Design a protein around this nucleic acid. Structure first.
Lengths: 633, 636
DNA sequence: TTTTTTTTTTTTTTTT
């Protein structure tokens, strides 16, 4: 049933309305129900309501519920969709109007960056992070309804003057070859609808009432497109929280909720404050943490659930200790409270802080998911290495051999492989094993049986040795095929091969520490050290492990916001730019994602650059309500 | 020679006769010949024969043939036309005998639907497919010479009695603003003709001999018009094939071939049965499939052409693998056989199934053409330009004024229009014309009146001018409002503008040569040039597009291809559920019959093994049709 | 340091 605010937002259907749903307030229920009502209580034909969101997920999720309350029929034609779906669908539908049609495949992300590489070879470094900016910064001036020259105007800085020119060639090639990146799909009808009234109204009448979720994420283009979509008839309901604006660095106009209030003054801010997920204690902290932010709309959250357990603040000594402690504490909790691996979540600022957890987690046969990113254990360089090791440990895994055969770079053609397989198959065994039967010698010969022997040899003599000197063996397995060189030849920019390699050491060193065992951890047979690694290789129980950003709009019973140091959470970059407000929002989000218990963690020391630094507790931990926080020792 | 059937068709010129030209028969030949012959061998005077058709195409087609076996003398001075052109002309012509102003407005269907939309808002669901039924169903109580009232009687069902009402509303607005949708073009003369004798005869004496093609498509009014026209001599020759009656849902009485057989004593069916296009296997198949359908008229196709390859029936797994195999096999066949994508045709029951084929063909650099895509006479840039012309030649066309006043963009606000209308209303006359009553000056003034007057004046001046230099007037009409620029502002990308523009030019040009007059057809006054465009006699016409012929089953209707790919051969789709769960499929049967008969060399069926229907899925069973077909020549 | 974005099917055909 509807809690008052919800109720109110649901009923106010007569004008430009803004619902300021605090976290866990249940917006999607409102929206749905708004729709459902709009239909059943004010006639307002289904086909005349547009529900816009940002992700193709929210999208299906919303469609799910809608149809779950609305009867198959009446629910007919709901303009539920992403911005981009529509934005495109406009371009599409009105192009068919002039009688004509369109045909220029959206330049899906990659394609762009790609095109951007060839576009900026000598101009700009062969680097990902770089190109990223280039991409992003380009996609910005675009959301700043600008031209590749108007942008050289508003262009202060060396590589920026460059990005501008580069930018120039981007739209250059695109306008030309006849294709469009994503944001184009918005600033497309946006323009096409402003410049022309004929079309404008047709939409204005298609889209009788519009609802928009996740409004704090809105960018200019969308913003306008929205305005255009319902200019002053203004029969809508935008929905958001300004304290959850975090993708500002990506065209999200923070003051969107305010800007709205201006070019729309009969705005009725209805706010949802009741929370259905977090304990009182969590909410209190969050509630306070965020009040240190210069605040406009007052929003003070509250739930009807029990005050929880104290927010603990585990202080780790170094980068590793942290992961160790968490994974450790993750496990205990879990054991003692008989819960599920998925009730847990581990959140960080940057993507690297993940690497080390990925270790312990895996090292402790604790299943997980690297939502925010890509699990170390997939990265080909490591998948490959794994397989050799899998082979070594188990010469019956055709899977692995089939994969490592020539991949490190020998000359064992598919023939010399399918024929060994074919003879191995009827002699009933593994390839590597059968790659030794003297009867296989004449089913296949030539130069293929001249590389297969050699290789399958090199392996076995190493596999032999690993039997007592794993490390050595592996170490030898490494420099042996000179994966290093191989990578440098296969990997794109060397820096990638460099990293692709760095990974390879990492793995090995892990694998080593494990074989070496330790003071309390009795050492492992290479076979186990392997199986540990291997297990890695959705209706699954596993620890959500992702970045705060990754976490936006999710929840989990137990959260470990790790790395609560200054440089890190209050991200140094931002630290020194005086914008923290966002970082703060960032934290506050993090925090409001946990529902039963929350734990913060920080490293007492970080390795600056071989130079070790003793960082200070994310000021955030301090602004929190100390009565409910429990710093360790 | 000419095959006997054909011949006898041609020699029989003494009474009520029907030629049952089966698929491939030679239909166009015979007609041309019969007219040529009527004249030459029978003494009939070129100016007394009328050959009616359904489309402005066949008509041009026919006029070409005929015209080239005779000369402009007997030729260009003969009555070949569509029904509507005739129906209209009857209206016009006898309005003149009555000396009245024919200033009504032809409501091109689009114009029609829209009017409905408005007139049908809260009443009915803002939906295409909906409006359609509304339109159609409306165009039929009409085609059944029925009132918006007697129709409520002949109304069973809710959204139906609704329609009747809406209809009431439709006919209501029409009759009032003085405009007529196409159906009125036939229903008017007909009535006009049966209610009065003086006229009747007059026409009975003008059209001394009439021939009507594609008779199986005749609807009531149509037919009734015929009857009237032909009166008692019966000197005529309708031609057709009830086995090809597929637009039954749009007013076509299938039983026409029969109905005819009755109101007419000595009907002498003559039946052409020799195909000359499809292989004996195709014909085989087709001739058989059709037999499952009931029959009052007995025939059987059969060509001399060699018996051909086996009718293959590719079973695909999903919505997409279907298009995948087709485009694939298409490519293959062409490669090793080498035979322009034009030789190739893919035909579906509905248009969605186009959406997936368009992919793979384009995904494979295969050029192709897409069945039916918004007549040129519907591009906004055109309907706009038309409107002006409409208004220029007929100042009594509010609809047209109403669409133009501000469109090319002056500053004539809806108020300023609201008030023109009111004044124009009370004084009972045009907005345009009212625009000048000195009395309007007081109901409205300020800036609108300034804009209003400026405009309507300019227009007047053009109007005045066109009197003498049609093109120069139109020429200045265009440049005058800067339509070009307009497009460049209104149109999305610039290229579309240029295109939209190009379209404008073209129209200009046709209009021109139409005015400038042909040496086969006598020159036209601009008012006529208009009525033509109004009928969308776009006059189509060497270097045709050698790409894929992709179209609906309906878009096949008389058209031939060497190799066809009759896709989506499942139950639901092909024999459409609408029909399935209706009791009549005979229609869908014909539908297929046709689709089949359309390929001449080799046919190939195809069925999706799984649906993309219901958001989920379904394991569909082959178009029963597929199984009624000769198993011997069929493959899997 | 952080990272979404989708050309189908709307589910029957269309002169004049």
């Amino acid at each position: 049933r509807l809690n008052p605010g919800q109720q109110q937002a649901v009923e106010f259907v007569t004008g430009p309305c803004l619902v300021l749903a605090g976290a866990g307030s249940g917006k999607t229920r409102v929206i749905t129900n708004k729709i459902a009502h709009l239909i059943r209580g004010c006639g307002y034909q289904a086909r005349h309501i547009a529900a816009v969101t940002f992700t193709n997920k929210a999208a299906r999720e919303m469609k799910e519920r809608v149809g779950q309350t609305l009867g198959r029929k009446e629910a007919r034609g709901l303009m539920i969709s992403t911005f981009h779906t529509l934005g495109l669908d406009i371009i599409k539908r009105e192009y068919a109007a002039l009688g004509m049609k369109a045909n220029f495949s959206l330049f899906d992300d990659t394609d762009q960056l790609a095109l951007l590489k060839e576009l900026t070879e000598g101009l700009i470094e062969d680097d990902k992070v770089l190109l990223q900016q280039l991409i992003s910064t380009i996609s910005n001036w675009k959301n700043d309804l600008k031209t590749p020259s108007q942008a050289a105007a508003s262009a202060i800085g060396e590589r920026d003057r460059i990005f501008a020119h580069c930018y120039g060639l981007y739209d250059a090639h695109l306008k030309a070859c006849n294709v469009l990146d994503f944001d184009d799909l918005i600033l497309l009808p946006t323009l096409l609808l402003q410049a022309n009234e004929e079309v404008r109204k047709r939409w204005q009448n298609k889209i009788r009432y519009l609802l928009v979720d996740e409004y704090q994420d809105t960018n200019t283009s969308q913003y306008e497109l929205v305005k255009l979509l319902v200019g002053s008839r203004a029969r809508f309901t935008v929905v958001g929280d300004d304290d959850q604006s975090i993708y500002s660095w990506r065209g999200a106009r923070p003051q969107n909720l305010v800007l709205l209030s201006q070019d729309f003054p009969a705005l009725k801010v209805i706010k949802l404050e009741q929370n259905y997920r977090s304990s009182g204690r969590i909410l209190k902290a969050a509630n306070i943490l965020i009040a240190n932010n210069p605040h406009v709309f007052e929003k003070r959250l509250f739930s009807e659930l029990g005050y929880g357990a104290e927010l603990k603040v585990l202080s780790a000594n170094n980068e590793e200790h942290e992961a160790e402690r968490v994974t450790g504490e993750l496990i205990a909790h879990h054991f003692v409270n008989k819960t599920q691996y998925k009730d847990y979540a581990i959140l960080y600022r940057g993507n690297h802080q993940s690497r080390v957890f990925e270790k312990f987690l895996m090292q402790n046969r604790i299943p997980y998911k690297i939502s925010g990113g890509t699990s170390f254990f997939s990265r080909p360089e490591i998948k490959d290495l794994l397989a050799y090791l899998r082979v070594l440990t188990n010469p019956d895994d055709d899977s692995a051999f089939l994969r490592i055969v020539n991949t490190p770079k020998r000359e064992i053609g598919p023939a010399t492989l399918k024929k060994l397989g074919e003879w191995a198959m009827t002699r009933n065994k593994s390839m590597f094993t059968a790659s030794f039967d003297m009867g296989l010698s004449q089913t296949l010969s030539g130069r293929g049986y001249e590389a297969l022997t050699r290789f399958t040899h090199w392996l076995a003599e190493i596999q032999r040795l690993a039997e007592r000197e794993p490390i050595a063996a592996v170490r030898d397995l490494i420099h042996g095929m000179d994966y290093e060189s191989w990578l440098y030849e296969t990997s794109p920019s060397p820096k990638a091969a460099e990293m692709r390699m760095k990974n390879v050491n990492q793995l090995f060193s892990w694998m080593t520490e494990m074989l070496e065992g330790s003071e309390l951890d009795e050492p492992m047979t290479l076979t186990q050290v392997v199986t540990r690694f291997t297990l890695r290789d959705e209706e699954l129980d596993q620890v959500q492990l992702m970045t705060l950003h990754a976490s936006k709009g999710l929840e989990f019973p137990y959260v470990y916001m790790v790395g609560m140091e200054e440089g890190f959470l209050p991200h140094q970059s931002s630290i020194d730019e005086d914008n923290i407000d966002e970082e703060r929002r960032l934290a506050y989000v993090g925090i409001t994602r946990a529902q039963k218990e929350l734990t913060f963690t920080l490293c007492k020391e970080r390795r600056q650059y071989g130079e070790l630094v003793r960082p200070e507790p994310s000021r955030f931990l301090l602004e929190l309500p100390q009565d409910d926080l429990i710093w360790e020792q």
